[PDB]
Every structure is written in structure tokens, then in C-alpha cells.
Amino acid sequence: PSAEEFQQLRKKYTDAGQGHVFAFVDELQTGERSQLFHQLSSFDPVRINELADKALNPPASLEPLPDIATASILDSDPKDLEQWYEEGLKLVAGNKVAVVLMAGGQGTRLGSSAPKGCFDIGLPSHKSLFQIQAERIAKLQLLAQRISGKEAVIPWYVMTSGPTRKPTEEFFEQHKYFGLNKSDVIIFEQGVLPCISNEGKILMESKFKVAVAPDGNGGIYQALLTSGVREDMRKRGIEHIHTYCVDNCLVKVADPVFIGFAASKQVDIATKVVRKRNATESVGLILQKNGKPDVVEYSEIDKETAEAKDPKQPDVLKFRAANIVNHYYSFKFFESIELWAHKLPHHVARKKICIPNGIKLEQFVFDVFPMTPLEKFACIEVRREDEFSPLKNARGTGEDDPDTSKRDIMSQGQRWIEKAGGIVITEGVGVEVSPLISYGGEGLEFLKGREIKAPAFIEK
Ligand SMILES: O=c1ccn([C@@H]2O[C@H](COP(=O)(O)OP(=O)(O)OP(=O)(O)O)[C@@H](O)[C@H]2O)c(=O)[nH]1
Numbered sequence: 437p438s439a440e441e442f443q444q445l446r447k448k449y450t451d452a453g454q455g456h457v458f459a460f461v462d463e464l465q466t467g468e469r470s471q472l473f474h475q476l477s478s479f480d481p482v483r484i485n486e487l488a489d490k491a492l493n494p495p496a497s498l499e500p501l502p503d504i505a506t507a508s509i510l511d512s513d514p515k516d517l518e519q520w521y522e523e524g525l526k527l528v529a530g531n532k533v534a535v536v537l538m539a540g541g542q543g544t545r546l547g548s549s550a551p552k553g554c555f556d557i558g559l560p561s562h563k564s565l566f567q568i569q570a571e572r573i574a575k576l577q578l579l580a581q582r583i584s585g586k587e588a589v590i591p592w593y594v595m596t597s598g599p600t601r602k603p604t605e606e607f608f609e610q611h612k613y614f615g616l617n618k619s620d621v622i623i624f625e626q627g628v629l630p631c632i633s634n635e636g637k638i639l640m641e642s643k644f645k646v647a648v649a650p651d652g653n654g655g656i657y658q659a660l661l662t663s664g665v666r667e668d669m670r671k672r673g674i675e676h677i678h679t680y681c682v683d684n685c686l687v688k689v690a691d692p693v694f695i696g697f698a699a700s701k702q703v704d705i706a707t708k709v710v711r712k713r714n715a716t717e718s719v720g721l722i723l724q725k726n727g728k729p730d731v732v733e734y735s736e737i738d739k740e741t742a743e744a745k746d747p748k749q750p751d752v753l754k755f756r757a758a759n760i761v762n763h764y765y766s767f768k769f770f771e772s773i774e775l776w777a778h779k780l781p782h783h784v785a786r787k788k789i790c791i792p793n794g795i796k797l798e799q800f801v802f803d804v805f806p807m808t809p810l811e812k813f814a815c816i817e818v819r820r821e822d823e824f825s826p827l828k829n830a831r832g833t834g835e836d837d838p839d840t841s842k843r844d845i846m847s848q849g850q851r852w853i854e855k856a857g858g859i860v861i862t863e864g865v866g867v868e869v870s871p872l873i874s875y876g877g878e879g880l881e882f883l884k885g886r887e888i889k890a891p892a893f894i895e896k
Pocket residue numbers: 538539540541542543544545546595650651652653654683798799800801
């Protein structure tokens with residue numbers, strides 16, 4: 437940039453109240469000066485003032501979702517569960533199923549230097565979360581091929597962000613895309629936003645770098661349009677989309693039961709929950725808030741509401757639908773994004789950010805739920821120990837960490853083997869079962885009668 441191009445950009449920022457981002461220009465080495473110029477040209481400071489103004493200058497009725505919107509792997513008719521599986525697999529076979537992996541988050545409490553998906557939780561195989569999830573895609577495709585005779589494809593749209601993008605692209609590349617075909621793995625970006633003070637002033641990471649953060653998991657909807665991903669899905673003939681977080685080590689990627697369940701209710705949005713078993717669990721819950729599908733924080737649930745027993749089922753809680761951020765969307769729903777993408781608010785996330793101190797402005801993925809007709813919303817309860825194991829904290833926390841994650845995968849593996857007639861001997865811990873061997877506990881008949889000495893790794 438010329439001196440006059442630079443000064444034009446300094447004026448735009450100063451006029452917007454944000455001129456302090458050039459405060460250290462005098463001491464910058466031209467290359468650094470060039471970087472700040474380009475980074476600052478990607479943001480409109482007026483738009484940032486808008487979002488910051490709405491964010492900083494802005495008793496519900498709670499009922500569970502209606503019986504007609506809900507199901508349970510635990511309680512539903514196994515006949516339904518099996519029909520849903522069979523039908524969901526058919527949609528996979530038809531190449532109608534896509535996955536969006538939400539992998540743009542910075543993960544600032546596990547505090548890895550790498551993207552969370554690269555994390556090695558300590559399994560015998562030493563596989564990353566990325567690889568495990570990819571092998572589930574691979575395995576499910578081969579399962580679908582059995583019934584159809586034809587190749588099945590589930591496109592894997594990996595949503596990253598600025599801080600996550602490049603190292604994720606390099607990791608997938610080094611790992612030869614985990615045995616999937618390149619064309620079927622699509623890495624894309626959500627937008628980022630500068631982090632702001634309590635007074636809405638842009639925060640500086642360095643003298644020549646603005647502190648940025650991804651704009652929330654809710655930024656997914658806009659990012660589908662911007663990245664060109666929704667229209668890629670159009671070309672591919674996608675009709676059904678499964679979306680989850682990279683941190684879930686137990687994720688049933690493109691779960692046919694979930695797809696088959698959602699498709700048969702002809703809903704636009706479905707969700708997975710696990711069971712809340714004790715009233716004191718600090719878990720966000722899916723329910724109707726003011727006659728509308730929503731996710732409500734645990735703090736907003738009074739003692740009496742949390743404690744209430746289900747009248748139709750007195751041994752379990754009335755409000756028990758613990759949110760695991762695991763969603764289905766119809767393609768029809770994705771074509772409606774323009775009509776409401778602007779109706780999603782940026783929330784104030786007070787985090788520790790530079791040169792809790794700051795704010796990250798974030799959209800919430802579930803904020804579209806109350807905008808969605810109750811008749812277009814579904815929810816299925818699943819088994820935690822088969823489906824939900826978040827990597828959220830560093831080792832030594834005792835909760836949602838590498839060890840709980842490893843435990844969850846390795847005790848699943850053992851249990852799967854034991855159900856198939858396998859004899860697991862632990863003179864020592866569990867057994868790691870490769871998704872390339874078993875997606876969901878099937879195809880282990882060959883282990884009947886065999887002694888496996890734990891800890892162990894069953895691989896192709
Ligand atoms: O791909 C994603 C995923 C999540 N997020 C956003 O991250 C916010 C933080 O919550 P997360 O649940 O994503 O935890 P994290 O791994 O980011 O860990 P921390 O940074 O909180 O220490 C969530 O509210 C979501 O909106 C994204 O921006 N992009």
C-alpha cells in the first residue's frame with residue numbers, strides 16, 4: 437500500500453472510533469506495516485461498531501418438547517429404531533447425506549497449540565479425533581455399499597476458521613485424507629471477528645496484529661452460503677445434513693438412525709440429546725421455552741423444574757433432554773438461510789484475550805431453533821456411553837478430558853467385543869476397536885471365542 441492508501445484506511449478507522457489500532461505504526465518494519473494494513477482492510481469498523489452496540493446495549497414458561505417430536509434409543513420401539521437405521525442407511529447409499537464438522541473453535545481451555553481435531557487422546561493407535569471420525573465415514577460408506585452394490589459417498593465439509601484453517605489443511609494432507617478421496621473432503625472457513633474491550637474497542641494481539649476469534653458455531657449458516665458449500669451440496673444432490681462438534685470423540689458420524697428418524701418426521705431440524713439422570717447435573721437442555729424449540733442454560737432452570745419427575749414415566753426426570761450439540765438439517769432448511777441469517781444475534785463471550793479481559797462476539801447454532809416451527813423440530817435421546825464424550829479440558833481435571841475420552845472409547849470397544857462373544861482378559865483399561873473394523877459394534881463375529889489381552893487395539 438502507498439502512504440495515501442494507508443492513510444485512507446487510518447481515516448476510516450479513526451472516524452469509526454477505532455484509530456488506536458494504528459497507535460504503534462511508527463515502530464513497524466514495513467512487512468509488519470503491510471500485514472496490519474491487509475488484516476484491517478478485511479474488517480469494516482462501522483459493522484464492528486454495529487455488532488458491538490447491539491451486544492453491549494440491548495420469566496419464561498418451560499415445557500418439554502411434545503411427545504410427537506421426540507424419541508429415544510433407550511425407550512423407543514426397537515422396531516422403529518431398526519426401521520430408522522435401515523432407512524437412514526438407504527439415504528447414505530443414495531449419496532443424499534452430507535456432514536458438516538464444526539471445527540473452527542479455538543479450544544482455549546484444552547489449550548493445545550494445534551487444532552483440537554489433531555489431538556491424540558492416548559489410545560494405543562495414537563489416532564487423532566480427525567482420523568477416528570474419518571474412519572467412521574469410511575466404514576459407514578462401506579456398510580451402505582453392502583446393501584446397494586454401489587459406492588456410497590458422504591461429503592465431509594470441515595468448517596474451520598482463520599486460526600484453525602492452515603494447520604488443519606496440512607494435517608489432513610500429511611495424513612493422506614485418512615483414506616478418503618480428496619474430492620469428498622471439503623475444508624472451508626467461517627468468518628472471524630476482532631475481539632473487543634468492554635467499551636467496544638478493537639483489541640490488539642500485537643503491535644501489527646488485531647486480536648480475532650471465530651464468530652461462533654452459529655456462524656455456520658452464513659458460512660455455508662459464503663464458502664459456496666450449500667451450492668456444492670446442491671450439485672451433489674444432498675438432501676440431509678448431519679452436523680456435530682470436532683470435540684466429540686464418540687460421535688456416530690452420519691448416524692443412519694438419526695438421518696432415518698429425522699427424514700421420517702419430515703422435519704427441518706433434528707437434534708440429539710443424552711439423558712440427564714440427576715436433577716443437579718449442570719447441563720443445557722433442549723425443550724420448549726415459551727412454546728418454542730430452544731436450548732436453555734442450566735442456570736435458568738429453577739430447583740422445582742430441575743427436580744420434576746415425568747408424569748408418564750415417574751422414574752425419570754421431566755426435563756432430561758441434555759443437549760450434545762448434534763444436529764440434522766434438511767437441505768430445504770439450508771435454502772432458507774437468507775431469510776433469517778441476519779436475525780441471529782452476536783452474544784457477549786467474556787474470555788481471557790493481547791497488547792477475562794475481553795469479549796468475543798459469537799453467534800449460537802441453536803438460536804435458529806425458536807425461529808423454527810415446533811412441527812419442523814425433532815429430538816432423539818441417545819446413549820451417552822455410545823455417543824457423547826467431549827474433549828474440553830486438559831488432563832488432570834477428571835471431567836471431559838483426554839482420559840475420560842480414552843476411557844469412553846476403550847470401554848466401548850471392550851463391551852462391543854464382549855457382546856460378540858469375545859473374551860477380553862485384563863490382567864492390567866479396555867480395548868480400542870478401529871472404526872474400519874466396527875462402526876457401531878457390528879462385524880465382530882470373528883472375535884467370538886478369542887482371547888484378547890487388554891489394553892489392546894483391534895485394527896484392519
Ligand atoms: O466450530 C466452531 C465451534 C464452536 N465455536 C464457538 O466456540 C464457543 C465456545 O464454546 P465451545 O463449546 O466451542 O468450546 P471451545 O472448544 O471453543 O473451548 P473454549 O474456547 O470455550 O475454552 C461456542 O459457544 C461456539 O459458538 C465456533 O466459533 N466455531
